[PDB]
């Protein structure tokens, strides 16, 4: 996990857990210990940048979109939505995985790709209820979650996003 | 400066009696006792007036928890010892030390966790896909703070009521520096 | 006692 | 020769040692443990994708020969096989041949088994279905 | 049992790449050469 | 309760039918079964429970439930018990249940 | 093995009175009476496990709980008991429950 | 509870009674008469275990 | 002929490597089979177990350690104390690694 993060190609805890069979508690405690060790030998003996921070959600979006087979235009829109999604306090505390998945789902229905949430959550191993629950929060601020140029050109209109 | 004092929520105090107990006897003759040796090696007992729980071990050691005040824990521990006395066992109130105090509060404004995790990297650990709260390990006093986006702070690790106040007064400035919007 | 694991072809 | 190999030989090779059987015998230590297990992994059909490349961040996209030459990438496709995982169990009564029975666990998915370099202008390459104009668009020489 | 670890795709990928990058047909020499592009007839 | 009566008849019928073998092992006569059955029945109807065919320490008339517990848990003041295959007596009235749920708040 | 708790119920108490009354009469052996009770546990356990489908729920306030030797003990005060229909108001209901998983 | 905790000396096998008797004998500074043994185990008459000890 | 996959290459590769999906297979989950079962046991009084071992030893004149712990179902720690107090183990003999009752009480 540290090695992936240092290379700017960071992965998620679940993705690494798919190969190495270790439950979450031991994983977290070991990671905290090793980070302290690296920091300790960075001062006495660099190590981290803006990347070392846990969330760094923008890095996950390109791979998650690839798993769904979306075009690059949707991926860029998802990155913009996820980047601006941190201004909302009702969602900012959520896990970076959900922040990226809900942003991807918002754009999937914005460009009208026929992929249902039942498969988006099944592909990225995220509960469908969580996806739709988060989508509701990412509906009161849609004007701030869509790139101005895309709406200006005419590629996407905000009336294609269903409203509850 | 802050004007807000954190409120204590739990006090884990340990007491000794200097005598060996028979846990089965305590479980059968105590009002609210739950002795299951297969899982744990103590009889779990509760009382209602201070609302505290006690883990009474076979070596005469007691672990009272749940009290909201330093003195309330003493009253709870004393009553637990008295209950053991009324059973017949040789039980005397003895060394009472508070081993942990937990306090909670709220600064009343959102906090950018990504900031503390970056500016303060030698103390703070922020892994938000495991726990939604940042973990700040203050070095003096040695107390652990759980900082959340909603602006709620949890203080745990203090052994007296002074350290928990001292920690918060030392963490308010760095928390205010990272106020979102 | 056997090797408790063997391959049949 | 390459078309024959990809079309027919790949399937034949995997259908030679497809079956792997691991037998866990009785191991008589107590009469509550007298069952003998048999785990079997079998390989089915093999599938091949179009040429593709996976980047460092984990995104996979179609690769064309022009980009591979410039980016020092290998022009290759992926290989997938259907794998069936069966488990039988039988009661090992002493001094008798066993009657292995399927114990209601027959899992049956595609497994990635590596990447196969693709010869250009072959059935599995992107340029076999390309016209002269298409080759010019792809920066390939007719 | 993790099927993702039981089958190492790197085995097929490296063996074919190494044998084709070099001429070493194993794990015969000169089986693969850098194609001449000096002229069309070449 | 008709169900309570029906089960009670089943229980007593099983006991008298099953105990015959051990009685012959002890060499006691057949009539003792009838006396045992008779006295037992008269006691049941005498109880008049249901209709029939015939401080910090621990220190009929008391309501009592005797059963089995499948799993019991609590959440900080709230106890939830999943009971099964029990018999209860309330206000001189008896009931039988295959399953039961207890939801009490420990004040 | 089967639990002996049912002897505290109405049917068990009546059986004890009957057998002991016969014991006083001298017409039954004491050990034979024990044999009756051991088989009594079997039949009561079997019939209750197989020949009932009613479900009842009780809601109230715990005045005292306790656990020891795989036997829970609750005392629910001011509780409402519903069977399958009609609610029953109870001032003090004492519950004794043994483990569902029979201890061999 | 302690009184009921004490177990009748009529153990499953005679060997166990001898084992406890030997253990009790060794924990004495000086030799103990038969009377002390008879006080330990509720067997006043000539018991086989007593012979087995000899 | 071999079958060529016409799906998007990224979609076909979503099952491979470090994937967000978790395996739902129950095949060869040997670790799960025996790791699931686990229960602790409290040391019972010596006065009762000591007698229990003698009836057991009367049954068979040679008891293995694994079999003994299974029958007693007690921790090996306490169980060792009583076993050494009553029985002895012959390691170099043909019946190696097997406890047998001491001759003092066996010869009776």
Terminal CA-CA length for chain F: 33
CB A103 within 8 A of CB A142: no
Q: What does the alpha-carbon distance between residue I74 and residue I43 come to, in Å, rounded to a whole number?
A: 7
What 3-state DSSP class applies to G18?
helix
I44: closest chain B residue by CA: B37
Determine A/B contact with 3+ CB pairs under 8 A as the test. yes
What 3-state DSSP class applies to I50?
helix
Show which subunits contact H, needing at least 3 CB pairs below 8 angstroms.
Answer: I
CB B64 within 8 A of CB B76: yes
Range of the structural domain that residue A90 is part of: 57-153
List G62's β-bridge partners, or say none.
G76
Write down the residue that tokens 């629950």 correspond to.
A133
CB G79 within 8 A of CB G58: yes
Nearest to H11 among I51, I58, I105 (CB): I51
Task: Tell me whether F2 touches chain B (CB under 8 Å).
Answer: no
Q: What does the alpha-carbon distance between residue G15 and residue F11 come to, in Å, rounded to a whole number?
A: 11
CATH of the domain at A141: 1.10.472.10
Task: Tell me whether F49 touches chain G (CB under 8 Å).
Answer: yes
Task: Tell me whether E2 touches chain I (CB under 8 Å).
Answer: yes
Nearest to I26 among D46, D105, D110 (CB): D105
Token pair listed for D24: 């866990």
Q: What is the resolution of this structure in A?
A: 2.9
CB burial of D123-140 (b: ≥16 within 10 Å; e: otherwise) equals bbbbeeebeeeeeeeeeb
CB atoms within 10 A of CB A87: 13
- Establish whether the linkage from the previous residue to B141 is cis, with ω within 30° of 0: yes
Beta-carbon contacts of I35 under 8 Å, excluding residues fewer than 6 positions away, are none
Interface of I with A in 13-32 (CB under 8 A): 13-14, 17-23
Closest C-alpha among B11, B3, B4 to residue B103 = B11
Q: What does the alpha-carbon distance between residue B3 and residue B22 come to, in Å, rounded to a whole number?
A: 50
B31: closest chain G residue by CA: G64
Contact H14 I108 (CB under 8 A): yes
Number of H helices, E strands in chain I: 6, 3
CB burial of I69-108 (b: ≥16 within 10 Å; e: otherwise) equals eeebebeeebbeebbeebbeeeeeeeeeebbbbeeebeee
Beta-carbon contacts of D101 under 8 Å, excluding residues fewer than 6 positions away, are D88, D89, D90
Closest C-alpha among D64, D65, D62, D44 to residue D113 = D44
CB H38 within 8 A of CB H44: yes
Q: What does the alpha-carbon distance between residue D60 and residue D58 come to, in Å, rounded to a whole number?
A: 6
By the 10 Å C-beta count (0-12 exposed, 13-18 middle, 19+ buried), B17 is classed as buried
Phi, psi of B162 (to 5 degrees): -75, -45
CATH number for the region F2-47 comes to 1.10.287.100
List F95's β-bridge partners, or say none.
F88
- Residues of chain D positioned with their CB less than 8 A from the CB of I26: 105, 107
Determine G/H contact with 3+ CB pairs under 8 A as the test. no
Closest C-alpha among D69, D61, D83 to residue D120 = D69
The residues spanned by each domain of chain G are 1-53, 54-100
**Complete DSSP assignment for chain A:** -HHHHHTT----HHHHHTTS---HHHHHHHHHHHHHHHHHHHH------GGGSS--GGGTHHHHHHHHT--HHHHHHHHHHHHHGGG-HHHHTS-HHHHHHHHHHHHHHHTT-S--HHHHHHHTT--HHHHHHHHHHTTTTGGGSS-HHHHHHTS--GGGS---
Q: What does the alpha-carbon distance between residue A41 and residue A31 come to, in Å, rounded to a whole number?
A: 15
Write down the residue that tokens 């020969």 correspond to.
D65
Q: What does the alpha-carbon distance between residue B12 and residue B102 come to, in Å, rounded to a whole number?
A: 9
Long-range contacts: I53-61, Cβ < 8 Å, 24+? Answer: I53/I82, I53/I83, I53/I86, I53/I87, I54/H12, I54/H13, I54/H15, I54/H16, I54/I86, I54/I105, I55/H12, I55/H13, I57/I86, I57/I87, I57/I101, I57/I106, I58/H13, I61/I100, I61/I101, I61/I106
**Complete DSSP assignment for B83-108:** HHHHHTS------EEEEEEEEEEE-S
Q: What does the alpha-carbon distance between residue B105 and residue B8 come to, in Å, rounded to a whole number?
A: 9
Closest C-alpha among G42, G45, G76 to residue G62 = G76
Q: Which contiguous run of DSSP H or E holds residue I73?
A: none
Q: What does the alpha-carbon distance between residue B174 and residue H12 come to, in Å, rounded to a whole number?
A: 74
What does each C-alpha distance from I69 to I36, I75, I80 come to in angstroms? 20, 7, 10
């Amino acid at each position: 996990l540290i090695g992936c993060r240092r290379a700017e190609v960071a992965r998620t805890f679940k993705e690494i857990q798919s190969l190495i069979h270790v439950k979450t508690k031991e994983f977290g405690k070991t990671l905290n210990i090793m980070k302290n060790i690296l920091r300790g030998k960075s001062e006495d003996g660099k190590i981290d940048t803006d990347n070392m921070s846990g969330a760094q959600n923008l890095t996950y979006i390109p791979r998650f979109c690839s798993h769904l087979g979306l075009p690059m235009q949707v991926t860029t829109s998802a990155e913009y939505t996820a980047k601006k999604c941190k201004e909302i306090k009702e969602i900012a505390g959520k896990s970076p995985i959900t922040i990226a998945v809900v942003s991807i789902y918002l754009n999937i229905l914005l460009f009208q790709i026929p992929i249902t949430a039942a498969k988006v959550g099944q592909t990225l191993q995220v509960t469908e209820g969580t996806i739709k629950s988060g989508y509701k929060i990412l509906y009161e601020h849609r004007d701030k979650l869509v790139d101005p140029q895309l709406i200006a050109n005419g590629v996407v209109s905000l009336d294609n996003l269903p409203g509850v | 400066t802050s004007g807000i004092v954190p409120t204590l929520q739990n006090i884990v105090a340990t007491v000794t009696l200097g005598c060996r107990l028979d846990l089965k006897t305590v479980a059968l003759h105590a009002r609210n006792a739950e002795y299951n040796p297969k899982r744990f090696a103590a009889v779990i007992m509760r009382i209602r007036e201070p609302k505290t729980t006690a883990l009474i071990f076979a070596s005469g050691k007691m672990v009272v928890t749940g009290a909201k005040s330093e003195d309330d824990s003493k009253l709870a521990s004393r009553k637990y010892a008295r209950i053991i006395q009324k059973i017949g066992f040789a039980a005397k109130f003895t060394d009472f030390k508070i081993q942990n105090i937990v306090g909670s509060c709220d600064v009343k404004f959102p906090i950018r966790l990504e900031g503390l995790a970056f500016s303060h990297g030698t103390f703070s650990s922020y892994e938000p896909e495991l726990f939604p709260g940042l973990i700040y390990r203050m070095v003096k006093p040695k107390i652990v703070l759980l900082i959340f986006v909603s602006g709620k702070i949890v203080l745990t690790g203090a052994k007296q009521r002074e350290e928990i106040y001292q920690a918060f007064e030392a963490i308010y400035p760095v928390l205010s520096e990272f106020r979102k919007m | 006692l056997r090797r408790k694991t063997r391959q049949l072809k | 020769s390459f078309n024959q190999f990809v079309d027919y030989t790949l399937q034949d090779i995997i259908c030679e040692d497809s079956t792997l059987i691991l037998e866990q015998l009785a191991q008589h230590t107590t009469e509550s443990d007298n069952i003998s297990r048999k785990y079997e992994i079998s390989f089915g059909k093999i599938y091949v994708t179009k040429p593709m490349v996976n980047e460092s961040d984990g995104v996979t996209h179609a690769l064309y020969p022009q980009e591979a030459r410039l980016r020092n990438l290998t022009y290759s496709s992926g290989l997938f096989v259907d794998v069936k995982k069966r488990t039988y169990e039988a009661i090992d009564v002493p001094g008798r041949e066993l009657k292995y029975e399927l114990i209601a666990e027959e899992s049956e998915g595609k497994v990635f088994i590596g990447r196969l370099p693709i010869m250009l202008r072959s059935k599995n390459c992107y340029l076999s279905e390309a016209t002269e104009s298409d080759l010019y668009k792809l920066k390939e020489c007719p | 049992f993790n099927m993702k670890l039981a089958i190492n795709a790197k085995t097929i990928t490296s063996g074919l790449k190494y044998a084709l990058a070099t001429g070493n047909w194993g794990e015969r020499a000169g089986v693969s050469q850098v194609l001449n592009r000096y002229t069309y007839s070449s | 309760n008709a169900e309570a009566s029906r089960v009670y008849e089943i229980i007593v019928e099983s006991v008298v039918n099953e105990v015959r073998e051990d009685f012959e092992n002890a060499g006691i006569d057949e009539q003792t079964l009838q006396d045992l059955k008779n006295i037992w029945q008269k006691k049941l109807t005498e109880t008049k429970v249901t209709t029939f065919s015939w401080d910090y320490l621990i220190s009929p008339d008391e309501n009592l439930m005797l059963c089995l517990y499948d799993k019991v848990t609590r959440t900080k003041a709230r106890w939830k018990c999943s009971l099964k295959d029990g018999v209860v007596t309330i206000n001189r009235n008896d009931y039988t249940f295959q399953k039961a749920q207890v939801e009490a708040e420990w004040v | 093995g089967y639990y002996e708790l049912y002897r505290r119920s109405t049917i068990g108490n009546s059986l004890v009175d009957a057998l002991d009354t016969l014991i006083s009469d001298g017409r039954i052996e004491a050990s034979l009476a024990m044999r009756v009770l051991e088989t009594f546990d079997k039949v009561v356990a079997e019939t209750l496990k197989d020949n009932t489908q009613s479900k009842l729920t009780v809601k109230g306030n715990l005045d005292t709980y306790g656990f020891c030797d795989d036997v829970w003990t609750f005392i629910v005060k001011n509780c409402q008991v519903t069977v399958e229909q009609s609610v029953i108001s109870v001032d003090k209901l004492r519950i004794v429950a043994c483990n569902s998983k029979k201890s061999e | 509870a302690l009184q009921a905790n004490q177990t009748d000396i009529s153990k499953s096998h005679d060997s166990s009674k001898l084992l406890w008797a030997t253990e009790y004998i060794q924990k004495k500074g000086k030799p103990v008469l038969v009377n002390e043994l008879l006080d330990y185990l509720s067997m006043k008459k000539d018991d086989k275990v007593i012979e087995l000890l000899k | 002929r071999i079958t060529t996959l016409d799906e998007t290459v990224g979609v076909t590769m979503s099952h491979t490597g470090m994937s967000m999906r978790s395996d739902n297979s129950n095949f060869l989950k040997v670790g799960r089979e025996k790791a699931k079962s686990n229960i602790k046991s409290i040391r019972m009084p010596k006065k009762e177990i000591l007698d229990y071992l003698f009836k057991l030893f009367d049954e068979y004149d040679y008891w293995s350690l694994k079999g003994l712990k299974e029958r007693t179902r007690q921790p090996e720690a306490h169980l060792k104390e009583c076993l050494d107090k009553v029985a002895t183990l012959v390691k170099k003999g043909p019946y190696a690694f097997k406890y047998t009752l001491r001759p003092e009480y066996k010869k009776l």
